[PDB]
Design a protein around this nucleic acid. Structure first.
Length: 165
RNA sequence: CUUAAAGAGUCAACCCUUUGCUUAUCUUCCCUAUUUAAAUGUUAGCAGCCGCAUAGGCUG
């Protein structure tokens, strides 16, 4: 599948990962990831890396995405579209912490608050140490951290560039 | 075989009483604490809903 590169440059004044996350947000908000364009990162060791890599099967051109990232052009670099027979596809993994599932136990099982604390008191509290990005969510008005990890390649992708199922 | 060799010091108790260390003091003048600077380290791990799950997925 042919692919394109979006490398964050000159982001020292601002962290590199903040520019990476803003690149993800601007690629989300102006379309791009309809259902078939996916992201991958060549340098996840402990950081998310500074290269966004889009491996759309139909083909991503330079002009559409450089018009999309007109806001990041001061510290971005776009390579010409190259080809890759295999891309290392990542997916979204989310975390739950206490009250999250407590409200689920309010609205699914219909139990009271104290017994919902009782079934979950000694449980939960997982801690994801995977490399991540920090995403502005616009439909739900709060900003969060989204965790990415390696999984088998899927035909369909989300609106963010990660695998489905 | 070392002035070798050897050896029970025991007992008992009333230190008493008394008392004026008082008096007066000038510490005091003086004066530059000055000038900087990214808090970075992703700085957050969320809100619903798909579900029997506090298993596993999806949505932004």
């Amino acid at each position: 599948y042919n692919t394109i590169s979006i490398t964050v440059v000159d982001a020292d004044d601002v962290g590199v990962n903040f520019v990476v996350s803003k690149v993800l947000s601007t690629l989300h908000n102006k379309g791009i990831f309809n259902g078939e364009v996916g992201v991958t990162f060549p340098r996840m060791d402990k950081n998310v890396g500074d290269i966004i890599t889009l491996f759309s099967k139909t083909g991503v051109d330079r002009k559409v995405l450089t018009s999309t990232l007109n806001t990041l052009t001061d510290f971005i670099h776009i390579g010409k579209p190259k080809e890759a027979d295999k891309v290392k596809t990542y997916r979204k993994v989310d975390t739950k912490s206490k009250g999250k599932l407590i409200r689920r136990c309010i609205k699914r099982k219909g139990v009271s608050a104290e017994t919902a604390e009782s079934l979950y008191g000694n449980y939960k509290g997982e801690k994801c140490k995977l490399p991540y990005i920090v995403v502005n969510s616009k439909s739900t008005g709060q900003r969060f951290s989204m965790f990415l990890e390696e999984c088998e390649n899927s035909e369909k992708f989300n609106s963010y560039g990660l695998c489905i199922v």
